[PDB]
Amino acid sequence: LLKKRAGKSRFVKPRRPYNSEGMTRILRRYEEDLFCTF
Amino acid sequence: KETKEVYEGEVTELTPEDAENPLGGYGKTISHVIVGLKSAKGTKTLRLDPTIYESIQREKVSIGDV
Numbered sequence: 001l002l003k004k005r006a007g008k009s010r011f012v013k014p015r016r017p018y019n020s021e022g023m024t025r026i027l028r029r030y031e032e033d034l035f036c037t038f
Numbered sequence: 039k040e041t042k043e044v045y046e047g048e049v050t051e052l053t054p055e056d057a058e059n060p061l062g063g064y065g066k067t068i069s070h071v072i073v074g075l076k077s078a079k080g081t082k083t084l085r086l087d088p089t090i091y092e093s094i095q096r097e098k099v100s101i102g103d104v
Contacts, residue, residue, distance in 0.1 A: 024064075025061070025064065026089065032057075032069060033069070033070075033087060033088055033089075034057060034061075034067055034068070034069060034088065035067065035068045035088035035089055035091065035092075036060075036061055036064035036065075036067045036068075037064065037065065037066060037067075037068070037092075038064065038065055
């Protein structure tokens with residue numbers, strides 16, 4: 001088995017991390033507009 | 039020469055309404071701002087953008103103001 005192992009044996013990049021902590025939010029979607037504040 | 043569209047008068051009400059499905063981690067997610075205006079021989083309530091509430095709070099517009 002060792003001799004057979006020696007004989008026979010011897011993609012899309014991920015996106016950047018998005019961080020938004022403690023920051024306000026403006027969302028302009030297709031049918032409604034939103035504003036999330038603190 | 040220019041043309042200007044103007045809304046002006048005394049503020050009658052200022053109700054920043056809140057959305058049907060709020061998102062977590064935030065407070066008072068605003069969908070629109072309804073503001074009532076009163077002037078001479080005429081009044082009209084409006085339905086404004088939620089972003090203009092930030093400028094309303096910035097310029098300290100309260101009740102009874104023009």
